[PDB]
């Protein structure tokens, strides 16, 4: 599922500003 | 009912004109040096960042708890964050709205800049969202309603926010939201061009290096609502470059459980064409406030914090909603650093 792809995505922690 | 909404609307106009008067006053003569480091007992480090740290502190005389954001002047300068940091303090000491964090004290010394805010033990929406998975639509709507009012407020002052994400939203002891960061906030009439923000939340016109206006905040609201209600953002990938492609593509896939009303709102907020994006049309924020997804929202009751929150983090001073960090000393040089850069702070 999409959620599984996200949970496996590596961008699941806090996200920094560019 | 319509004349009650009309009267509601006129109340809002009147409120905003007054809020702007008071903002411009504090904005033209900001407070400075309203406390000093020794007035606080440091308890624990709650966060770290490229140019500073946040610490839980306790005011010795009052016993009240505060989050103290400590910025290393020299690193702020090296990383070219002078304007953002000056902007953050000046805005926070000037704004006044129920869903913003409360700046109580600020000061500087030879080495650092300090901003002292009322402590919110519940922590950031981010941790709770990731743990619970996703919020139900009523739950997501509760939070979204507070962002809508906050943006109506900030935008009325010509402030673009540009930093919306669950990371920058706290859940207070009544289950209500507090927006935290204002480094990227900027007073602007019309467009601006700085490439700033977080990849998942960037509007297409930011990515496309054309100018942009406050419509980027309404786009970001769409991203936030989507991520709260689905459990994942509408555009994600392993690298930022891959995220941007998806954002500009103009294609969003909605979860099968998203209501028809939610999807219709999100198509109008995640509208790649900024000239057709809700919140940027002739009727302004009212297109959002009057959308069917918000039909059951009592905007007055939300503003006055009268709605019972759908979630109250477990009341335990407590530190459990924040991670553990290696405790280090706050270094204060015997020499003044970057005095010219931070005179106004
Ligand atoms: O620490 S906060 O949650 C926070 C912020 C404001 C008021 C708070 C009241 N009670 C508790 C926590 C509070 N928060 C704001 C600061 C910490 N970061 C990131 C960060 C960490 C360290 C230095 C800078 C930054 B930054 O990107 O500007 C993001 C969230
Ligand atoms: O009408 S308000 O509740 C109000 C104020 C600010 C933003 C709002 C955004 N949406 C809806 C209502 C809003 N507001 C402005 C007009 C009414 N007074 C008077 C008042 C009303 C209730 C309690 C005390 C004082 C103060 C509160």
Automatic annotation (TrEMBL), chain A:
It comes from the Eukaryota. Extremely potent competitive inhibitor of cAMP-dependent protein kinase activity, this protein interacts with the catalytic subunit of the enzyme after the cAMP-induced dissociation of its regulatory chains. Belongs to the PKI family. This is UPF0418 protein FAM164A. It comes from Cricetulus griseus. The chain holds residues 6 to 23 of 241 of the full protein.
